[PDB]
Specification:
Chain D: Belongs to the eukaryotic ribosomal protein eS10 family. This is part of a larger assembly, with chains A (170 residues), B (67 residues), C (55 residues) and D (98 residues). Chain A is α+β, with helices and mostly antiparallel strands and 170 residues long. Helix content of chain A is 38%, strand content 15%. Chain D has a single domain, classed as Orthogonal Bundle (Arc Repressor Mutant, subunit A), CATH 1.10.10.10. In chain D, strands 1-3-2 form a three-stranded antiparallel beta sheet. Chain D is globular, with a radius of gyration of 13 Å. The chains are: A alpha+beta (170), B little secondary structure (67), C little secondary structure (55), D alpha+beta (98). Bound molecules: magnesium ion (2 copies) and zinc ion (2 copies).
RNA sequence: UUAAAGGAAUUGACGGAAGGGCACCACCAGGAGUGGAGCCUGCGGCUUAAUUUGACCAACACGGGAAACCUCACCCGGCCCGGACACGGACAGGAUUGACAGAUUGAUAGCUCUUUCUCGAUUCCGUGGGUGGUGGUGCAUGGCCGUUCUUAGUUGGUGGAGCGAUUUGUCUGGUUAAUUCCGAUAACGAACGAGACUCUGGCAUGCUAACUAGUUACGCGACCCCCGAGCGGUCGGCGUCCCCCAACUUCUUAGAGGGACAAGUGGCGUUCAGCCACCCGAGAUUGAGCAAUAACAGGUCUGUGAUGCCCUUAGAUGUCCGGGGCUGCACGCGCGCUACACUGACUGGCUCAGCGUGUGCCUACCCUACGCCGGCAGGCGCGGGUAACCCGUUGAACCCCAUUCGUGAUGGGGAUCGGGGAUUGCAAUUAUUCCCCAUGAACGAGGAAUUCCCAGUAAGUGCGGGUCAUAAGCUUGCGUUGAUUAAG
């Protein structure tokens, strides 16, 4: 029917984008998620996942895409044949910050020393071709009071606009 | 912390364990004892009530005059 | 129960019927441009919408 | 919940024709949008899938305000029996697109 | 009787210790005030069935908290189960839903009761177990945020000094908004912060480009004109991409690129860093954003399906419905609004804006032209607008010009209060707001004390976003008019 204003066009598909980011975070966190990227056409829309483990999003003949197409389709108002999903591997696993934030999540769920787990990931980004990185793990460590242990290495800027694209946080 | 006024119980039903709404003489004879509902659905089906005088269709809540 | 007056107070106009579309509070929410998110964590997704601050 | 038997088959036939169902966390909604033909409130759509969790059959995640559900394979073999279906009917889970 | 008392050094914090710098959250010099008045709104106290609550520079128009109900926690009552699963019981010869009438209620709640029909394993009962919670605990936490903290500050590597904690680097000086640089030197080479950077503002009669922006010209129409002309004057009247019955970009909107660097010229300075003057020029410091290291028992579990632990779970702290409360007033404090008039108030003429916002998936209801009813708020008919297409050339107020008034608590001020009229709404009472008539209180520039600010700034003055069914004395933005003091 009648269409809506351009000002609320742009906040509606921005909030479309933010919603399925949050769900595909909650689903694919254990499977190396690392974000999404959307393209709308006046046909089939195509959403590519940026999973690091593209094996695990695939089921036995790709189940967990086809039911993950269905929940995207049966919530966000798409007809039968208008949204498709693809899994794609993001280059340099240890250089996007969302990926190994989730990796050391399941390493600390694995029951490591928090100093042992953070060193393995600090050593991993700096050997993956990085200019600097730092990890802050903060909360209830060994002790009744919470405290924060940060593990900075290399150099890192903090102010201006180039800490918008030269960095990524997680 | 008291509740003096005693909200008494829930609803437990009357639990009347007998149908017998078809009396029979002469060794086999169909005979109603309760009126049927006059609705569009249950002609001689789900009964209409028999009170001390009135009739009432329980399923679709229509009632006949108190007589 | 007794469906006639379970949810019978009219949730219509008024802040007892607006709510957050993410986060399900009824307080502080921003109904501008059809956002309908909570005040406190509009700020989370503000970059995911695409709203940059000044830089 | 209170479980009307027509409406449980109504939600099972949709939860078995595809391996998903997409209720939203609001109890006071008289009309499930994808069912929309048996005037079902989504009270029942919640409280059926509550039981399907506790038998180990369905698998939930929760969105912003939405419930998403998936079929585990123990749930699929339960639904081929309760819908009384022959062991050739499968959902859109396994292979209907190529 | 007691597990330290003590010694020398080190790092911080402090000093009513010195030396050098800096800040309108510091002062001077000032402005506007606030502090006195009425009112609006937050907090304390009192009162109350409850007057829910969090916070005491860095709490107090703060939880974007403007509560008629819903929100909502609190108070008085009343339904519901939205108690998943696991086991046993109940269990076709009688587990469980629902319900007309009537005492029954606040209630057309089968809430309960009397009576009786109806519903198809759905459940119900017991026991374990979940589950929910604006229930506790922010001193159990996460995340965000504020703050010491708008100041220049911080740290490794390797050498050197020390037994060591540590120190040098990171400095005598000069300079800078800035550990900013110059230079000096047991240090050298670096990193973060500062700066650059992004947004913004001012300039480019240069470029690209415009029936959703325009101008100029040319046609047509209208009107005035000594006297009667018109290449005269006025016109947001019409047309000229409507298929050439015109061109162009100054104005308008962007996009690119340019432009300012302390460059040039004197003077000072170690002729170092740089500073002070000018000339040229739109501009010789535009304004803001991000913003380190290390912290605080800072605030928030009442924002969150962030969450540990405890508590509660059916006569439930879950949830719904109805009523009430969060607005109660001998008082105290904090933000603010309107005033004390004549540099003003009236009444009428007259002319100027900019930022922006607009019909919704749930979600009902948007912005308003024009016409006609009404003395006013308003009411209808009729359009347009999903927007440089319509409201809208946003005819904003102050100010400007005339009129009345005359230093009188006055035609200043408009609190309080009576009666009426409309709109929003399920509902306006403890007045929602608006309109009309009447009533006409303090208040004469404010003690001690105290706040904010140095250029389109302070202040005056309206407008628009937020909240919004109805609604701004608040907040966040915008333009308008525009300075008095200072370069310490
Ligand atoms: Mg919360
Ligand atoms: Mg006077
Ligand atoms: Zn019938
Ligand atoms: Zn408690």
């Amino acid at each position: 029917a009648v269409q809506i204003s351009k000002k609320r066009k742009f906040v509606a598909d921005g909030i479309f984008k933010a919603e399925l980011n949050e769900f595909l975070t909650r689903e694919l966190a254990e499977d190396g998620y690392s974000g999404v990227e959307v393209r709308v056409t006046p046909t089939r829309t195509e959403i590519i996942i940026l999973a690091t483990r593209t094996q695990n999003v695939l089921g036995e003949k790709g189940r967990r895409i086809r039911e993950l197409t269905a929940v995207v389709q049966k919530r966000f108002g798409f007809p039968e044949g208008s949204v498709e999903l693809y899994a794609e591997k993001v280059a340099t696993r240890g250089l996007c910050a969302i990926a190994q934030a989730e990796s050391l999540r399941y390493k600390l769920l694995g029951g490591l020393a928090v100093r042992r787990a953070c060193y393995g990931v600090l050593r991993f980004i700096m050997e993956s071709g990085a200019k600097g990185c730092e990890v802050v793990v903060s909360g209830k460590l060994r002790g009744q009071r919470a405290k924060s242990m940060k593990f900075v290495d290399g150099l890192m800027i903090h102010s201006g606009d180039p800490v918008n694209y030269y960095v990524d946080t997680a | 912390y008291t509740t003096p006024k005693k909200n008494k119980h829930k609803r437990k039903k009357v639990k009347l364990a007998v149908l017998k709404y078809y009396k029979v003489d002469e060794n086999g004879k169909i005979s109603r004892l309760r009126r049927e509902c006059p609705s569009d659905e249950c002609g001689a089906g789900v009964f209409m009530a028999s009170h001390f005088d009135r009739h009432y269709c329980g399923k679709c809540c229509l009632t006949y005059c108190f007589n | 129960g007794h469906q006639q007056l379970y949810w019978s107070h009219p949730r219509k106009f008024g802040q007892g019927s607006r709510s957050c579309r993410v986060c399900s509070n009824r307080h502080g929410l921003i109904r501008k441009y059809g956002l309908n998110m909570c005040r406190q964590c509009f700020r989370q997704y503000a970059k995911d919408i695409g709203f940059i601050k000044l830089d | 919940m209170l479980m009307p038997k027509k409406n449980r088959i109504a939600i099972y036939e949709l939860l078995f024709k595809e391996g998903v169902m997409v209720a939203k966390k609001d109890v006071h909604m008289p009309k499930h949008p994808e069912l929309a033909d048996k005037n079902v409130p989504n009270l029942h759509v919640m409280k059926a899938m509550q039981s399907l969790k506790s038998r180990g059959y369905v698998k939930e995640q929760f969105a912003w305000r939405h419930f998403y559900w998936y079929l585990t394979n123990e749930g699929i073999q339960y639904l081929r029996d309760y819908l009384h279906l022959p062991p050739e009917i499968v959902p859109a889970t396994l292979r209907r697109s190529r």
